[PDB]
Amino acid sequence: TDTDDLLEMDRAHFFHPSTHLRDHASGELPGRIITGGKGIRIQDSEGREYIDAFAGLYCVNVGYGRTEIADAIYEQAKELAYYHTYVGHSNEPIIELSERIIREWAPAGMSKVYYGMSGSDANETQIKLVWYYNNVLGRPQKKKIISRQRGYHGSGIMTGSLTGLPAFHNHFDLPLEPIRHTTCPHYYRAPAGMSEAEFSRHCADELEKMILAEGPDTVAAFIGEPVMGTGGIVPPPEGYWEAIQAVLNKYDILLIADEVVCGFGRTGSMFGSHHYGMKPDLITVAKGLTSAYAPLSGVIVGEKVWKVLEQGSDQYGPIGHGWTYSGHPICAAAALANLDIIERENLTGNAADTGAYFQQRMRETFGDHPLVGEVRGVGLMAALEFVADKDKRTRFDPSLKVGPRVSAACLEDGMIARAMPHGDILGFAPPLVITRAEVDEIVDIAKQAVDAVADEL
Amino acid sequence: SHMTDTDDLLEMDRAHFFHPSTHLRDHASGELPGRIITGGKGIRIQDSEGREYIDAFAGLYCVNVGYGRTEIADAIYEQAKELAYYHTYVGHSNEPIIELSERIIREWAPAGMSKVYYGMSGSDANETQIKLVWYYNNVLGRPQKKKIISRQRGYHGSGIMTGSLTGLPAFHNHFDLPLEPIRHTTCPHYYRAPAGMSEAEFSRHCADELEKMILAEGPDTVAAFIGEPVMGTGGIVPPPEGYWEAIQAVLNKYDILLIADEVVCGFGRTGSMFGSHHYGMKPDLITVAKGLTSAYAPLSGVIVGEKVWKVLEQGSDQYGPIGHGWTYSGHPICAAAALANLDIIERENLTGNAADTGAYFQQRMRETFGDHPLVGEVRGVGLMAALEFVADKDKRTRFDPSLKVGPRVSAACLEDGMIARAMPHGDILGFAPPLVITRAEVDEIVDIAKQAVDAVADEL
Ligand SMILES: *Cc1c(COP(=O)(O)O)cnc(C)c1O
Ligand SMILES: *Cc1c(COP(=O)(O)O)cnc(C)c1O
């Protein structure tokens, strides 16, 4: 078959991200070629159909098969596929997009957008900017960046260091200096007997303790996803963001909001920052910026950092930072069409409405399930965490592969939901066009899967 | 399709768009006016006011098939309609990325290459390289063997670790770079070589400097050496005769991996398939971007040799799935753009054009500028070339940087409708035209440059 020939070429020549390299190459872990899709459904090269309740990777937010977006990419590609944006050069779509991000989407007090292609390159830029900012101000020691356990901020050297999951550290010598990781903001794993408000205060106090141990004048920034994505779909505890921000303000520490997942509608607000009342100095975007139709990332720079960057150019000349593809015309054109759709179909409001329905349905269906320790989520992201003992929150032996098994049972029933890393967790992040009826279908399939695995154990 | 309201767009630009590599205050205030590029065809681009320019820099060494390829726009469009995106994590794939991987390995990359890993930028690809080099040494039980040796004036990206690799001060100053464990050895620029050394002697001097560095560091602590076959952003600097052979012998003696950064030289520019082919390099790892898609869509590649690949597979045995991935790794539309780009390069034999019209280019530049009083050196290979300007040709004396001699020659070219780059940290005029360029277009470029160089020479 054509699939067999392609799979063969794949195994012989393609190094996949996040794959068992030996077992892929040998054919021990079979591959899958995705060829098409529409709305929330995708299709493989053998014609099999799947409900994609993970929207690729939290990213195909307007759904699959938007010919509107393909048309917009095509028109830009015909007119001017590329020019650089170095030394004040520009193109029409990147200018239009920058104005739209600032005026209509980003929180108030944001000033400028800098572009790359990945969440990783955007967070790399953030770190560079934070160091530069402190050097411009004559604070050479104020450089440490505090991230969080289970946070996800990319897969590079410095960005993998920010990331708080061991797969991105082990055997890569990370994290490097000067990165630190504070408390995982996951109430389910809070110290025993803590209320939610107590746990938010515990997180704040642990951060303070870290800042004092480091010396506050050496701590430049704090980076956090409003809701943790890859670390297990973890909304923050009640009062967390207010308690954290008071500590950061007390010690003059910049806040970076990593909105790569929460950006552009997924929580039911425009950004996760809007949803939780965060006031970041710097914002990272990607994924839902284009619904993955073309690669694009953004660093949204607040007025306070921007003023210092302008001061920096006065004293030091043009900023020594650029990517060849910064502000790429076709990627910008894809973003514009994507945002047109999000606005026109009010997918932010759908994420709030169908999302609340999703969360309610998940709680009803799984809140008393013997296998499920916690049901959590906000808007159109949700997860089920599985435990061996609900009373003591005891984890399964990782060799039992409980999460991966529930995910595999879902896939047998034609639905894609992710076995989240470093845990037994089933995550959902469907396209923002999903209907309530489609939510029912997803929940029903998950219910059958969770039951099947529970019976086996 | 539609005219552009230039004044209004320029205004929105200044108020909201943070450009790469721009004077941020002067851009925002309007003191450095912007330029909006709206169109292009072949080697010419057009701004929003309708002005036309010959782009002798191919954007940034990247628009290699030339501008306005509707064939590539069609291929992007067909993939975007069929499947704009899915991830390639856990063995998932798409048809164009599989096809591209096979074509890169079987038809383009040097012998002994095994696999391709994908990103979107030269910078993210070199970031992947460093991760892979450290992982490789950890798999082998050599935790100390981690240092990466780069070179003065080398260019490898604009990130934290990649900017550290980069050997130009603009990417270091006020960013606290370079970090450990990066080192920089000798700039392979013969024009600035110790006086009275032949080219081959200077190659041996560079080899000996590298060896000295390795011994001072302790060879068991040195993991890899990274180099562009020909330096791009560091001033269009072909290596001296014998350089790559002499370097490789040192790297082999001390079990040090070679990374070839082919972001510029990859896919035809030197008149060979890769710079590695052209100079007889045998890299363990290869970085590509730019000419991989002719910039029609963002894509980068890390080409992994058989020796590193074997250890990566061994690593998976020991440690499980590799903890590395970008969301857009193997992006379908970017892969489709690459395939159409490579079809054009192969069909029109742009590698051969780069050799033929390139040799003509180099010869024409020598004839025109080899005795010019302002020009210390004419250099290049294939379709990259530079003029380096000096205040005294006998002693190779540099101009006071405040005279801005390089920027002024570039600005005079632009007045005459041609884009050629004032290269950073020196007085150097660089050329890297699209690979479709004709001899006739080379004559036009050379003539414009001649007038520009004469004009600035008169002013001094
Ligand atoms: C996916 C993700 C990233 C990394 O983006 P890439 O485009 O994969 O580099 C960064 N931060 C968060 C919060 C993400 O979810
Ligand atoms: C341009 C360049 C890079 C970085 O590529 P980006 O796509 O700009 O990140 C790396 N290496 C070399 C030799 C380059 O010319």
Side-chain angles (χ1 to χ4, degrees), chain A residues 154-414:
Chain A
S155 175
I157 285 154
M158 295 307 309
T159 58
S161 298
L162 297 171
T163 286
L165 297 160
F168 298 87
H169 296 166
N170 297 349
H171 322 299
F172 304 115
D173 303 346
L174 308 180
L176 297 183
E177 282 287 17
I179 311 305
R180 304 285 182 274
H181 291 90
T182 188
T183 315
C184 182
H186 188 183
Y187 180 56
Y188 187 58
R189 301 285 171 199
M194 278 196 178
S195 83
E196 198 150 330
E198 285 176 298
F199 180 61
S200 285
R201 291 305 322 170
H202 167 82
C203 292
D205 292 343
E206 289 288 280
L207 167 64
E208 270 223 65
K209 186 203 298 185
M210 174 172 284
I211 289 162
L212 296 166
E214 291 298 335
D217 57 306
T218 70
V219 180
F222 181 98
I223 181 164
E225 296 150 279
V227 181
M228 286 192 298
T230 296
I233 316 300
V234 193
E238 186 64 32
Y240 177 86
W241 283 115
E242 301 68 20
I244 294 290
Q245 286 172 110
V247 173
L248 301 172
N249 291 343
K250 176 175 179 190
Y251 296 106
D252 194 25
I253 295 171
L254 294 168
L255 172 60
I256 300 161
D258 187 342
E259 296 268 9
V260 164
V261 166
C262 303
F264 307 93
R266 189 165 282 277
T267 64
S269 304
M270 290 187 197
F271 285 44
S273 286
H274 295 90
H275 203 77
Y276 292 93
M278 297 159 66
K279 290 173 168 197
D281 299 286
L282 292 167
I283 301 176
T284 302
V285 291
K287 292 184 174 129
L289 175 60
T290 59
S291 290
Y293 279 78
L296 193 63
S297 80
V299 174
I300 313 178
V301 181
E303 300 166 334
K304 176 161 66 163
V305 173
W306 180 254
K307 288 191 307 202
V308 171
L309 299 178
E310 288 193 334
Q311 179 189 334
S313 63
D314 280 341
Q315 35 189 126
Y316 305 141
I319 195 172
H321 188 57
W323 319 123
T324 296
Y325 304 143
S326 189
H328 199 282
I330 88 178
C331 299
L336 292 166
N338 175 56
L339 291 189
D340 289 347
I341 290 162
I342 288 164
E343 290 158 23
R344 187 166 70 237
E345 297 177 9
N346 188 12
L347 299 185
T348 306
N350 195 51
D353 298 352
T354 303
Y357 180 78
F358 187 28
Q359 301 309 320
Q360 296 159 345
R361 285 221 37 150
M362 288 287 270
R363 280 171 289 161
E364 290 155 14
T365 306
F366 293 110
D368 64 335
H369 200 286
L371 199 71
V372 175
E374 178 179 65
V375 186
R376 56 171 178 263
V378 62
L380 285 167
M381 61 198 119
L384 302 179
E385 189 152 352
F386 311 114
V387 299
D389 182 337
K390 291 178 66 155
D391 190 58
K392 294 186 152 46
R393 301 173 289 159
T394 300
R395 207 166 269 185
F396 285 99
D397 187 351
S399 93
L400 289 140
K401 294 169 189 307
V402 175
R405 286 159 67 174
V406 167
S407 179
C410 289
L411 193 68
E412 287 168 26
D413 276 351

Side-chain angles (χ1 to χ4, degrees), chain B residues 88 122 168 184 194 318 354 360 423 443:
Chain B
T88 62
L168 293 169
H184 292 89
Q318 268 162 247
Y360 181 74
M423 308 300 283
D443 291 340

Side-chain angles (χ1 to χ4, degrees), chain A residues 10 12-13 15-16 18 22 32 35 79 85 89-90 112-113 124 135 143 155 157 173 292 314 321 328, chain B residues 13 15-16 18-19 21 25 35 38 74 82 88 92-93 115-116 127 138 146 160 176 295 317 324 331:
Chain A
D10 185 315
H13 305 310
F15 177 174
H16 293 247
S18 185
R22 156 108 50 212
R32 179 177 294 112
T35 52
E79 186 53 35
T85 60
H89 290 71
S90 201
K112 301 286 176 293
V113 195
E124 186 78 346
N135 289 325
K143 301 292 170 58
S155 175
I157 285 154
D173 303 346
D314 280 341
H321 188 57
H328 199 282
Chain B
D13 187 315
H16 302 121
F18 177 172
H19 296 246
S21 181
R25 181 175 305 270
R35 180 173 299 109
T38 53
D74 290 346
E82 186 52 40
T88 62
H92 289 71
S93 199
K115 299 287 175 293
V116 195
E127 187 84 337
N138 291 325
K146 302 293 169 57
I160 288 152
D176 303 344
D317 283 341
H324 187 56
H331 197 281

Side-chain angles (χ1 to χ4, degrees), chain A residues 86 322-325, chain B residues 61 121-123 126 155-157 228 233 261 263-264 290:
Chain A
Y86 284 45
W323 319 123
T324 296
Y325 304 143
Chain B
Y61 332 80
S121 70
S123 293
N126 285 321
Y155 188 75
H156 305 294
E228 295 152 277
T233 296
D261 188 344
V263 168
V264 166
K290 291 184 170 103

